[PDB]
Amino acid sequence: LHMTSTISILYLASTHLSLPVYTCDYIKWICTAKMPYFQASEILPKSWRIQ
DNA sequence: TTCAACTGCTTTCGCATCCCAACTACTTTTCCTCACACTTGTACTCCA
Numbered sequence: 001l002h003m004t005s006t007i008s009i010l011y012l013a014s015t016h017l018s019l020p021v022y023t024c025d026y027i028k029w030i031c032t033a034k035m036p037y038f039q040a041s042e043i044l045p046k047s048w049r050i051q
Numbered sequence: 052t053t054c055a056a057c058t059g060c061t062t063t064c065g066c067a068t069c070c071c072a073a074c075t076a077c078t079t080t081t082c083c084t085c086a087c088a089c090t091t092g093t094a095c096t097c098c099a
Contacts (some may be wrong), residue, residue: 001083
């Protein structure tokens with residue numbers, strides 16, 4: 001499992017719903033850092049990071 | 052019959068070598084992502 005895997009399962013659930021989103025948008029949305037892809041370890045768990 | 056060291060005493064209460072640390076390095080802990088060499092047919096004609 002990798003951060004490539006949490007976007008892939010975010011895309012399988014998108015290509016189930018017949019959505020006009022594509023992997024162009026999933027690779028655009030993280031470079032603009034809208035959804036928490038890069039450095040998501042920092043502020044989100046707050047206690048599972050330390051151990 | 053004398054010189055020279057050994058001698059205890061001035062008050063009266065209360066005041067008053069071993070360890071630690073610094074910063075910058077290098078390294079390990081592992082987990083994740085793919086390639087590089089091998090092989091049978093098939094294809095394009097090859098010589099019969």
